[PDB]
Design a protein around this ligand. Structure first.
Ligand SMILES: *[C@@H]1O[C@H](CO)[C@@H](O)[C@H](O)[C@H]1NC(C)=O
Lengths: 107, 49
């Protein structure tokens, strides 16, 4: 349901938070604070809004812009990544202006 | 004094990289350890127009 990206990731520097609220993608850049292992339980310098399956994503940051590509499919093999081919297509190209060194995934 | 610029950095910015960090900069022999001194200086300066 989300990802965090940054240099220190939390506390003394800015970081990028992406969360799915189950109705919209919610995105923000801020001097965020969080635990060592956060959960999505029931300064905002940029702010934005918009096994049976495999979901695929690509994240990259270039010249202060952050690109996201994706693809979604049902799958036959229950174990892991099926041997086959299809291509991911662009979602967003966000002008976030930060540099990045670390990331983390949100359940 | 509402207008300011960064005097020194660890490395040069990438294109459109933005840096608002306030951390004290080691300008010579003194390791900063989170506090100012000789050879350890505040990273911003103000124009005083
Ligand atoms: C965030 O707000 C604090 C004051 O609450 C300010 O000192 C700091 O410069 C701000 N940083 C950014 C990245 O806007």
């Amino acid at each position: 349901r989300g990802w965090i990206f940054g240099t220190t990731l939390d506390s003394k520097t800015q970081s990028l938070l992406i969360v799915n609220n189950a109705t919209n993608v919610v995105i923000k850049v801020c001097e965020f604070q969080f635990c060592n292992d956060p959960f999505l339980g029931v300064n905002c310098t940029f702010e934005y809004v918009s096994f049976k399956n495999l979901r695929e994503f690509v994240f990259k940051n270039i010249d202060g812009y952050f690109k996201i590509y994706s693809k979604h499919t049902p799958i036959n093999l229950v174990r892991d990544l099926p041997q086959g081919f299809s291509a991911l297509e662009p979602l967003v190209d966000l002008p976030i202006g930060i540099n990045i060194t670390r990331f983390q995934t949100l359940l | 004094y509402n207008y300011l610029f960064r005097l020194f950095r660890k490395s040069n910015l990438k294109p459109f990289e933005r840096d608002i960090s306030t951390e004290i900069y080691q300008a010579g022999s003194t390791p900063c350890n989170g506090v100012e001194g000789f050879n350890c200086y505040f990273p911003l300066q103000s124009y005083g127009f």
